[PDB]
Target: Scavenger receptor cysteine-rich type 1 protein M130
Amino acid sequence: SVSCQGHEPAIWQCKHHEWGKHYCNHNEDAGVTCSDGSDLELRLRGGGSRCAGTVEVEIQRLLGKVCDRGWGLKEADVVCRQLGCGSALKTSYQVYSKIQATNTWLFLSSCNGNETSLWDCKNWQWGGLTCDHYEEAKITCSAHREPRLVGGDIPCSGRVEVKHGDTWGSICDSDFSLEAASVLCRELQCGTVVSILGGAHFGEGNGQIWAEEFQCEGHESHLSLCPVAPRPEGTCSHSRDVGVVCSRYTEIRLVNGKTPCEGRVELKTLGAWGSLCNSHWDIEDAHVLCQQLKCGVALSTPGGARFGKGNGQIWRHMFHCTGTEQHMGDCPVTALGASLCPSEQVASVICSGNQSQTLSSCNSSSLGPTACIESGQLRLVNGGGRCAGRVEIYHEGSWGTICDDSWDLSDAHVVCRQLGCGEAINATGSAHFGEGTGPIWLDEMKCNGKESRIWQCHSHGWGQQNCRHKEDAGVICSEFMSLRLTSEASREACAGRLEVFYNGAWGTVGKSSMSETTVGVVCRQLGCADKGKINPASLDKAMSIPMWVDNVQCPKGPDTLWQCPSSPWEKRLASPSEETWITCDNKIRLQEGPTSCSGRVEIWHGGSWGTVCDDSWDLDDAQVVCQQLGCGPALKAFKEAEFGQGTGPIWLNEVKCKGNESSLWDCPARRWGHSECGHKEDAAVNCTD
Amino acid sequence: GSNLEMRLTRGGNMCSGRIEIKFQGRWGTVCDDNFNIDHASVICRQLECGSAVSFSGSSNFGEGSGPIWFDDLICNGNESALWNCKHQGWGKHNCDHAEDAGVICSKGADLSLRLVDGVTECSGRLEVRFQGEWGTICDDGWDSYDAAVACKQLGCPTAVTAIGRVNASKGFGHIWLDSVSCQGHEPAIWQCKHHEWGKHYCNHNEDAGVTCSDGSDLELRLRGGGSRCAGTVEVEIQRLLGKVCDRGWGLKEADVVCRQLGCGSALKTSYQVYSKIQATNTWLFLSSCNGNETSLWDCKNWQWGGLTCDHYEEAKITCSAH
Amino acid sequence: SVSCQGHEPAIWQCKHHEWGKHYCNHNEDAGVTCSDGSDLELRLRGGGSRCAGTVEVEIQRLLGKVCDRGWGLKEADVVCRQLGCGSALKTSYQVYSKIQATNTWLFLSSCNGNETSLWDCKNWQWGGLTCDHYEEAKITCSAH
Ligand SMILES: *[C@@H]1O[C@H](CO)[C@@H](O)[C@H](O)[C@H]1NC(C)=O
Ligand SMILES: *[C@@H]1O[C@H](CO)[C@@H](O)[C@H](O)[C@H]1NC(C)=O
Ligand SMILES: *[C@@H]1O[C@H](CO)[C@@H](O)[C@H](O)[C@H]1NC(C)=O
Ligand SMILES: *[C@@H]1O[C@H](CO)[C@@H](O)[C@H](O)[C@H]1NC(C)=O
Ligand SMILES: *[C@@H]1O[C@H](CO)[C@@H](O)[C@H](O)[C@H]1NC(C)=O
Ligand SMILES: [Ca+2]
Ligand SMILES: [Ca+2]
Ligand SMILES: [Ca+2]
Ligand SMILES: [Ca+2]
Ligand SMILES: [Ca+2]
Ligand SMILES: [Ca+2]
Ligand SMILES: [Ca+2]
Ligand SMILES: [Ca+2]
Model:
């Protein structure tokens, strides 16, 4: 029990007990290890790289390990920081080799987590103790498998590349999957995954092609936390590089501001820098912009042009933000047919700059006629758009519906105007948009139509109702749009006239300024295919409906037509030579074959191409595939990847076609799921020319 | 040059371990990249130990990087020494991780094949001892030719060799071998061409297996019908009963069964149910028959167990002599 | 490893392992709770009546809950009978309101089912551990 302050000349000068009498045992004997600090080294061994494995220490040319008695993520962070491998993620790893056994151990008391090196942690013991009920300490830092995207114009699209040590290599499209894509867009903070594009869509890489597959479940926050399955080498070439498109494609910056936190809002689309205008720009949108830019919360949005107006370009996008979103790419945005706005009106925002503030809801709903988000939240569910669906309200930490009784247009007007959806066209009841789950918060609502919020209406009370779930209220608002392709044969098809449903009315789209990006967006939005072409006008036109919108220009990144800039809405009677007719490409494809009717079966669904597993594959199934492409009767139904390996996910599994189905979609099978089938089992067919 | 000497370290044996070369009086550990099976053969031939069965990257540590005298070498595999072939660098290297390239020569390697989880000795799963760990074999690429080599090596009757495991539920461990390609005359399984050790495209569910048998242990009969010429197909091999799954069941293969039973040609694939039949777990899978074979045992690549068919059902047949 | 029969005059008198420094890798520190039998109270909250909800235990004015390690209809029968609400039917309840959060927990070994009160079951532990893979104990008695 020697007690030394740290400046005594010798040990016996210190406080201690009587010489010769102690309760100690010879097992607990004291020693020291004095060092220049030259000989101390740290390593990770057995994990697949230098940033994963078992922590190995070598102090004065003696090898040891660290006992995990008090090992946590705070202590692991210091080691990963010391090695330069980023922050620690988990206290385990996936083994790749075997590491030799040593007898010596290193013991740690505790670390604050901000130390630069492990040797700076207080009271670490080298040897003198054995730990047998515990194991060694293992880490997996965040630089184990660092991903990146390259080769894309928009911020969150490009070629997938992962760093192995200090080199970057490409990935073949047979190894990537939809679950691994979710962990890659999420890790890079790019939101959800929109599409997977193989075959060197963004160009080819040079230097390395990693031969491994990530077995990701889909919820991991890093690619390092995901198991990796080694695969045979040389199975792919650089023409098979994989690429991804995530959902955060928006570019917003603040310019002409004295400080970086405040300035004039600017947006980049179609390759030009322009400024938004003040209409439909609110504090909720400004809160999200400041949070994304990491400035904090927005004090106010100056009117007029406080920071001036630069450049001739004006962008008329409208963002409908709740205020809780972290990125402007999460906010619903519509730019189709947006009205012109004067050059004087330009959006601005002045953020606090503290970066420490975090905002949340304040006070309560306060039912009754009359830096925090509103307590009551409104949303529309299951309507096919943001401006149609079943009305729901957030109260006491739950989402609840509104009773059909005494629900009319006057009650609907305040619902549509509060959400930024314009006026109300319909007020539907009796579960038109489906049955709801949860409490019925309101009943017998009576509104004059001039109110601001729904809780300002006269109602019986919060949760006081005699209703059932089959009578749930819904609205259809004025600013609600749907899209379809109309032909003579069918109202909805993959070829026909393009019609836009706006203000409760249908109408056509002008053909001028149509591009391949614009035609592709329509085909992907409707679910037909990935690309398309505009054919001349057909022989018959139905009802000669008036033209709604024109000059539609679609950038790269949107998957719906509502986000494409255009000219303002204008209902005009127009000749059939101006209306747009579009034919989409085939949803099924045969690839890697000597003849067009023989090859590997691919189907397009959910934004990306995919293959079909060969279990339950027969000739009757092959009959449908040859029928859909227009080929002749099938010769044989190949199995086990005869023609090659497939790209993308695996959509259809356990296919049982009756033999007379028009398309593979009508056949009963496991549809749009995550089966166990691998790409080695994709099916192929051969058809007569 | 002849001044260089190559030694193997950290493997526990002379013939297996990490490659070390002495240049200018210092040891060096060659980096793994550009390591072809030709160089593994040459290195095992330089030491005169034998052929090379594995070329593992071993501990690939950037820390403590040592200069490499023979890096990014290219060779045809016919030369007796590494320096004989064309060289890229001398004394240095441009390598990303991949340190301590190690080889495992055949003579120093200890490899064995055993059968386990079977009704008899010559039946069940196949396991391979690779460096002391027992590992399974992936069934992808398993045919009757690969079974014949395995039966000879295991010392079993080779009159009739059938793929598949009769009752082994699953295997635990590594999958050492995948896509074994034997011509049927090789002495051992590993002597044939296959994927690199450890690399596999499959799970532990599809483990390989053989059923070596001379004959008279497998009998075919029809049950549950009006007579012996109509009813469900029931097969019993080594006194283990089973039924045939109808994944590829047609009038061509059913004709072989009826002809084998002496019941004439095949009329229908169903029958009238007179009595019930007890259920059996194990299923017999056959790919396809030409209708010329005298018995089912003459059809190629018939697999006895190892897969399940939940969506399909048992095979049935009604012959003409009903 | 203190082993006593309940009649010894002190802890060191009854058979214990030895006097020495112990690591106790798997176990924790020992403690007791001595009571006259009046401070302990049991009640059910959040269920829409006194006979349904989440079992809330208050001992010496400390509010806590009961872990469901050994919770079953046989153990819940003691609680319903002790409260006087009949017999236990279901180990759940229909929610009517929200309940407070308490750090303390109660752990039960087993109850024969015929005990008059929960304070008569053998070897019940008041605090000292935590429940991470388990939840609170909820019952619905018959007289609900
Ligand atoms: C780490 O944090 C502790 C606790 O706040 C503080 O005393 C110490 O100075 C910090 N060290 C460094 C290097 O910032
Ligand atoms: C909405 O109201 C319009 C105008 O009366 C009517 O034609 C249409 O059928 C209504 N739709 C629904 C879904 O109620
Ligand atoms: C399969 O059954 C046989 C007897 O028919 C038995 O010896 C063997 O152990 C069984 N296998 C398994 C994996 O249970
Ligand atoms: C059956 O036909 C095949 C294919 O022509 C032929 O090779 C074989 O010899 C025939 N078998 C008999 C028993 O005639
Ligand atoms: C409860 O039942 C058990 C088991 O039969 C019995 O030993 C015990 O004495 C009973 N308790 C009372 C208080 O009757
Ligand atoms: Ca807004
Ligand atoms: Ca009603
Ligand atoms: Ca009303
Ligand atoms: Ca009512
Ligand atoms: Ca089928
Ligand atoms: Ca297989
Ligand atoms: Ca083979
Ligand atoms: Ca005791």
User: Anything to note?
Assistant: Residues A 403, 405, 443-444, 465-467 surround calcium ion (ligand 9) (CB under 6 Å). Strands of chain C lie at 41-49, 52-59, 62-66, 88-90, 104-107, 125-126, 138-141.
